[PDB]
């Protein structure tokens, strides 16, 4: 945290076991927060969160996963993450989905997204008790059966 | 694109790849690979007088592009080739196609996917050969090669006007004189300038003291910026009252009048990084054993030499220069050697000019103008240090990977090296990859940036060594490089390195150059030798003193306090009460300096200590560094700080805390360490290394102890002389010789009783040529060894000058009543520091040229008529006293014992030949007398290092020349442990050929768990010409030097030793001497000692194989003769080696074993499971025969595929269900089915097809291999219903 012309800035970096260089990207990414707690989502620019390329409801079909039930497909926890394409901004980030049932036939979806600090930030996402409020995507999909 | 036979296994000399063993997903082997034809006439291309170098390496290119072939063919696990990759013929080649992710679209079974058009570069890149490969640590399926041009292999082999050695034989017809190569008249004081002389200090402070003295007033120096432009106010440093001699003509350093035929590089710096044919360049590649698209390229980089020259240090812009500057400059200039810390008289090799400018002029400051208050301003250069094309191929091999980046090490030199050039690896190349390795950046850094940081703390070995720095990095290391490599967890660096100039760091009194002919040519540039070599008498009381003092004293009758002879018997006791007086008063400031009246003298460990660059607890500590190595002179290893290289810039980044002083002014008051200025980067780059090692884990003596412990591989003997009063004495140690002395009567008398040694009583061996009254006296000797100017008397003890009145009047004489006993060469002084003559530095050089073999030796006597030297009745090594025991004293290698030497080379006697040769050294009484050094008759240089190999998690080793050495403890240290081992040679055949190591053809680790290395008696080369009609009395060769004569007057017949032996006039004396001359060409030393032809006999040829000594983890324990409880640790280590001199292999000492095999022998490949000699040896995989996929008519299809794909394997690792592997492959009856396991490499659940490869447990390996037979495609399978 740096003061350069007594407006606060932000250079975050890349530490290396030990060994700091700066990495430029990824701080203009954290410097774009509106105002906000923490940085805002951009669906089209590839930000601190990254790029999450949300899978049609087509790949319903084609994979045949109308046989599997809601529950089914809820206690999934590697096909779950068959359902989009994800670009993460850094090494070792990582992006998940939490499912949420909305109705016997479609249920709503959450991102879960890794951080620089090591923390799974989502809708839920509460530091210091205050909400972050980020706005990520949200997508629904339906079309199960009810056996 | 399928193999060629035609193509035949080789190692390239430089880096000694022939190999990579490929491991992970699908091990194997790349291997490099060229045609085999003979009669490759390269003289048919013609050199004419009116071109230049670089249209004739394009003719020579051009036709080698016709006359060779060159490949790196792909090898399976049990040996056997896969495809051709004939870079200069493969049909159609491509980069390969990207997603948006940047990863390369691939398929196991399909291959990459190809964009169908070939990389950048590529009609210029075709024609080069590729020379080494390396794997991706984090990245499958991803590969670096490296590619040279043609001439990097054949350089050897093309025309030797154009590719010249740095001196020249000549016809001889005036007979030989290496003087005549030699400026050797001394400089004089000028008869129209003796006015300006550093004055005497007229008045000088009190400070409240209250002693005074009658001796000569220090002398002032002032220096401040005034306020001219281009002029300081005063500058007592530039004073120039001396000049040079007018015999025809001025002697000075002056290369368009001696250099008629200058040597120059083959290409330019700035034309290699243009003419893009003749740069070096990697790419990056993917390949995959078993698929339709098997190979293609990613990213092409070239290794340009302007990314490491504009990364070299702002210092390297003047190498003709130093942050001392002016009075250094003319201090070096009247003595008629090198200026700066690289110049090119001593280094062409990095300079695009060659000897054109092997100079003093010109060094980027204004110097020699008739005000000295003028000189000492920056101005333009013209010879900054570069990378012309001899050392850019040295400095090119030895890869490896980390990270998302690939580096190059440097080579050992032999790409490029000629018997009197020494191009060597002076820095790291990077190539660093971008946007998930769609994108690339190329970069590199010198050596001296990267190595700064090393310590006192760092090794386990010997301290102090020379390689020190500071702010300026004028300390230049380079490495003849062995590797680069994981040993378990760390990486590690190897190899032969430079240290500082250990030699030529004592300097002349100003008119005796005369009479000092080795020394001045070892600083010329014409002695290009890093051996010690002793001296004393002719040098200086100090190197570093203004030559405006030089002239205070030219009688030598009042003794010069501050310039005279250097004799350590004649200097000051200046005690509690006398520093008052004589130095204490001369305060100064940030304008003032002096010299002062304190007598100052020793010998060559006070010299080397002084103002050599030796490492201390501190880094960046090292404010005097007097030259650089010509050759590598130390051993090499150390671990490697791989996070720290992985983040450190591409571009480097200097500063004015890197400049020399712009004026002398701002010189006067030069801070030693200064704050980085904070944009610049340069000072991150010094923690690269954690740990170094340099030899045996050994403190003090104990070294030179080991020394005498190792065979030599000229005939097998050790130093020790103890395996057999009238018996010889040993070379490097001191334990036996001479006679026990007890130091008791030491020292000013000062203080000896408990002080120097572990025990009541404080005996120590006194060494050859040491001083005594009588044997009754044999402790100490008191003072009485005068010294006069003339025939003018005593030095003249209880005078003024040698006295001072303290507080009260109580006068009393500041001289010694008594000395030590010894001055000689192999002088060990554990009380005398400034007496002895044995240091850290040369034990190194002497542990590496005496592993090498070719430390040289001293000579009056060859074995032709009447001149020849004796055995019996010559020689008394029972009476080191006096001349009989024939100690020479005067220009002898340091540190050791010349007639030992002799005696262990077997020079004479009947030792190394079946008749005594009779060559050798006498000190005779009679008259004056004539000396030369001459080579051991081995031609190893230091070089010559092959293949760094990883033995195991922490013991790796390499070959170097005759040995293969071990670091077993490096990585994990223990106490009682020497830490090294070692095997010889044993092929007399390899050891006496004229250019040995082009018979070595690579080093390998065995599946028996013993590294081993390729011999071929059939690769040895002659000499470029068979001296055509006459006798080349100077024959240039791998162990030649232009040796200059020494000679001296009459030795005493007694009290011999108890003054140095005085020398004289040289520069007439080389045609008293012809019958040594004749000898300096070591084919004559080959011819005497009898092993100059057939004469050697045993093997007609016998070529094959090379293996290291057996070893446990009682090897190398040594902890008998580590510590003390009743002696001196030296002495007790001797004492346990001379039980020990028949049974050497428990210390890890001794002879490698040998096989021999029939025909070549050009280089292994290897695999995980297998080495294969020339390709040759492959087998039938026989552990596995039994292994194999069920064919298609074999499955039952809706049995397997009625279920998805997607439940046939476990998700988390994609290994097939246990139960389903019988299923799919064939076994024999009573196997263990817990052994084996399918893979799977790619599937689509949309076609219900699962692609597969089979995973087994090796017999030999604990770990996992694929089982090569298992199908007509190999490894590899796939699985559908019905649906392909």
């Known amino acids: 945290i740096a003061k350069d012309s007594d407006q606060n800035k932000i250079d975050i970096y890349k530490n290396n076991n030990g060994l700091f260089e700066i990495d430029t990207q990824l701080s203009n990414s954290v410097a774009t927060n509106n105002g906000g707690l923490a940085p805002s989502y951009t669906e089209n620019r590839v930000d601190a969160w990254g790029k999450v390329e949300f899978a049609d409801n087509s790949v319903l079909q084609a994979r045949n996963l109308v046989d599997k039930t809601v529950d089914e497909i809820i206690n999934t926890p590697e096909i779950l993450n068959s359902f989009f394409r994800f670009t993460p901004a850094f090494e070792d980030q990582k992006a998940t989905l939490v499912a949420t049932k909305q109705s016997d036939t479609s249920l709503s979806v959450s991102p879960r997204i890794q951080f620089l600090d090591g923390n799974f930030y989502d809708l839920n996402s509460t530091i210091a008790g205050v909400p972050l409020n980020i706005g990520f995507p949200s997508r629904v999909f339906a079309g199960f059966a009810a056996l | ?1284």
Do not use: C
């Open chain 2, 1 to 1284: 694109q399928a193999v060629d036979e035609t193509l035949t296994p080789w190692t390239w000399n430089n880096n000694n790849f022939s190999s990579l063993k490929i491991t992970g997903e699908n091990p194997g082997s790349f291997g490099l690979v060229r045609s085999q034809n003979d009669n490759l006439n390269i003289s048919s291309v013609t050199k004419n007088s009116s071109d230049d170098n670089l249209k004739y390496l394009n003719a020579v290119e051009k036709y080698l592009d016709g006359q060779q072939n060159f490949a790196i063919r792909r090898y399976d696990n049990n040996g056997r080739a896969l495809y051709d990759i004939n870079l200069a013929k493969m049909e159609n080649p491509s980069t390969v196609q990207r997603g948006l992710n940047g990863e390369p679209i691939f398929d196991p079974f399909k291959g990459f996917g190809l964009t169908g058009n070939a990389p950048t570069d590529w009609n210029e890149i075709k024609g080069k050969v590729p020379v080494e490969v390396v794997q991706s640590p984090h990245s499958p399926n991803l590969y670096f090669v490296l590619l040279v041009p043609k001439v990097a292999l054949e350089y050897h082999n093309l025309n030797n006007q154009v590719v010249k050695e740095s001196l020249e034989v000549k016809a001889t017809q005036s007979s030989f004189n290496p003087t005549q190569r030699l400026q050797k008249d001394s400089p004089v004081k000028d008869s129209s300038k003796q006015g300006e002389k550093l004055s005497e200090t007229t008045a000088s402070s009190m400070s409240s003291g209250m002693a005074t003295s009658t001796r000569a007033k220090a002398l002032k120096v002032e220096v401040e910026r005034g306020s001219q432009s281009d002029s300081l106010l005063k500058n007592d440093f530039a004073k120039k009252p001396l000049k040079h001699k007018n015999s025809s003509g001025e002697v000075k350093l002056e290369a368009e009048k001696e250099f008629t035929e200058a040597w120059k590089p083959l290409l330019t710096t700035d034309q290699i990084a243009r003419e893009k044919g003749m740069g070096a360049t990697v790419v990056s590649f993917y390949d995959a054993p078993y698929s339709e698209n098997h190979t293609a390229f990613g990213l092409v980089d070239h290794i340009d030499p302007k990314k490491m020259v504009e990364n070299y240090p702002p210092s390297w812009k003047t190498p003709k220069w130093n942050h001392h500057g002016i009075w250094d400059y003319n201090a070096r200039n009247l003595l008629l050697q090198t200026t700066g810390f690289f110049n090119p008289r001593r280094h062409p090799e990095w300079f695009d000019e060659g000897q054109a400018k092997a100079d003093n002029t010109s060094p980027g400051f204004k110097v020699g103008d008739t005000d000295h208050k003028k000189d000492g301003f920056k101005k333009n250069s013209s010879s900054p240090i570069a990378l012309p094309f001899e050392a850019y191929f040295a400095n090119i091999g030895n890869m490896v990977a980390i990270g998302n980046s690939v580096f190059i090490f440097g080579g050992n030199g032999h790409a490029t090296k000629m018997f009197t050039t020494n191009p060597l690896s002076i820095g790291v190349f990077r190539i660093k990859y971008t946007d998930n390795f769609s994108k690339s950046s190329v970069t590199g850094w010198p050596y001296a940036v990267l190595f700064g940081g090393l310590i006192n703390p760092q090794t386990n070995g010997l301290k102090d060594l020379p390689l020190g720095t500071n702010r300026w990095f004028e300390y230049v290391p380079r490495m003849a490089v062995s590797g680069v490599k994981w040993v378990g967890n760390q990486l590690v660096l190897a190899g032969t390195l430079t240290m500082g100039d250990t030699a030529t760091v004592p300097r002349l009194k100003y008119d005796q150059l005369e009479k000092h002919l080795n020394l001045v040519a070892q600083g010329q540039g014409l002695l290009r030798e890093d051996l010690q070599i002793f001296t004393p008498y002719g040098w200086a009381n100090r190197p570093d003193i203004p030559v405006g003092a030089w002239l205070q004293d030219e009688m030598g009758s009042k003794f010069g306090p501050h310039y005279f002879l250097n004799n350590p018997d004649i200097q000051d006791n200046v005690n509690n009460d006398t520093v008052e007086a004589l130095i204490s008063s001369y305060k100064n400031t940030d304008k003032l300096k002096h010299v002062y009246p304190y007598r100052y003298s020793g010998l060559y460990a006070w010299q080397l200590f002084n103002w050599s660059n030796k490492l201390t607890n501190t880094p960046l500590s090292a404010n005097f560094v007097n030259e650089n190595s010509y050759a590598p002179n130390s051993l090499f290893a150390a671990i490697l700080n791989e996070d720290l290289l992985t983040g450190l810039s591409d571009k480097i980044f200097y500063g004015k805390e890197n400049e020399f002083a712009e004026n002398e002014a701002d010189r006067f008051n030069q801070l030693l360490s200064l704050n980085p200025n904070p944009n610049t980067n340069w000072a991150r780059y010094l923690n690269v290394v954690q740990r170094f090692t340099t030899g045996p884990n050994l403190d003090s003596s104990t070294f030179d102890q080991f020394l005498d412990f190792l065979p030599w591989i000229g005939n097998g003997k050790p130093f020790s002389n103890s395996p057999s009063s009238s018996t010889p004495l040993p070379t490097f140690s001191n334990i036996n010789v001479g006679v026990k002395s007890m130091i008791t009567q030491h020292l000013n008398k000062e203080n000896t009783r408990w002080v120097f040694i572990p025990n009541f009583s404080p005996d120590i061996w006194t060494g050859a040529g040491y001083r005594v009254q009588s044997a009754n006296q044999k402790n100490g000797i008191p003072f009485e060894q005068v010294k006069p100017s003339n025939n003018s008397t005593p030095f003249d003890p209880n005078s003024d000058d040698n006295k001072v009145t303290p507080s009260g009047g109580s006068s009393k004489p500041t001289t010694y009543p008594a000395l030590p006993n010894s001055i000689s060469p192999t002088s060990d002084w554990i009380n005398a520091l400034t007496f002895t003559n044995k240091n850290n530095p040369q034990r190194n050089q002497l542990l590496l040229r005496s592993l090498l073999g070719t430390i040289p030796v001293l000579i009056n006597k060859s074995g032709d008529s009447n001149d020849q030297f004796n055995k019996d009745s010559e020689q008394k090594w029972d009476k080191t006293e006096t001349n009989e025991g024939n100690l020479p004293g005067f220009g002898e290698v340091n540190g050791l014992y010349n007639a030992a030497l002799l005696h262990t080379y077997g020079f004479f006697g009947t030792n190394t030949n079946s008749t005594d040769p009779k060559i050798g050294f006498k000190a005779d009484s009679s008259s004056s007398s004539s000396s030369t050094l001459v080579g051991s008759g081995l031609n190893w240089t230091s070089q010559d290092v092959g293949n760094l190999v990883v033995i195991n998690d922490t013991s790796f080793g390499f070959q170097l020349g005759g040995w293969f050495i071990t670091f077993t403890d490096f990585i994990r240290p223990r106490t009682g442990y020497l830490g090294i081992t070692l095997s010889s040679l044993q092929d007399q055949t390899i050891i006496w050929a004229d250019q040995p190591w082009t018979s070595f053809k690579g080093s390998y680790l065995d599946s028996d768990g013993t590294p081993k290395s390729l011999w071929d008696p059939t690769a040895l080369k002659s000499l470029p010409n068979s001296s055509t009609t006459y006798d080349t009395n100077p024959t240039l060769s791998p162990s030649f030097q232009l040796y200059q004569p020494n000679k001296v007057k009459a030795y005493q017949t007694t009290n011999t030793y108890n003054k140095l032996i005085e020398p004289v006039d040289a520069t007439s004396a080389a045609t008293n001497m012809t019958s040594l001359l004749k000898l300096l060409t070591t084919k004559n030393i080959k011819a005497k000692l009898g092993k100059g032809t057939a004469s050697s006999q045993g093997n007609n040829n016998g070529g094959g194989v090379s293996q290291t000594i057996n070893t446990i983890t009682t090897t190398g324990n040594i902890s008998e003769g580590l510590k003390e409880e009743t002696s001196i640790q030296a002495e007790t280590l001797k004492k346990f080696f001379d039980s020990k001199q028949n049974n050497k292999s428990e210390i890890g000492i001794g002879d490698s074993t040998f096989t021999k095999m029939d025909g070549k022998l050009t280089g292994v490949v290897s695999t995980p499971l297998v080495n294969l000699i020339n390709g040759q040896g492959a087998t039938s995989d026989s552990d596995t025969e039994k292994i194999s996929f069920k064919p298609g008519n074999q499955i039952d299809f809706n049995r397997l595929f009625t279920l998805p794909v997607t439940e046939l394997f476990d998700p988390n690792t994609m290994f097939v269900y246990d139960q389903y592997v019988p299923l799919l492959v064939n076994l024999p009856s009573g196997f263990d089915q817990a052994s084996i396991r399918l893979k799977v490499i790619s599937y689509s659940v949309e076609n219900q097809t699962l692609g597969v490869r089979l995973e087994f447990k090796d017999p030999q390996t604990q770990q996992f291999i694929p089982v090569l037979n298992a199908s007509s495609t190999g490894p590899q399978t796939v699985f559908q219903p019905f649906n392909q």
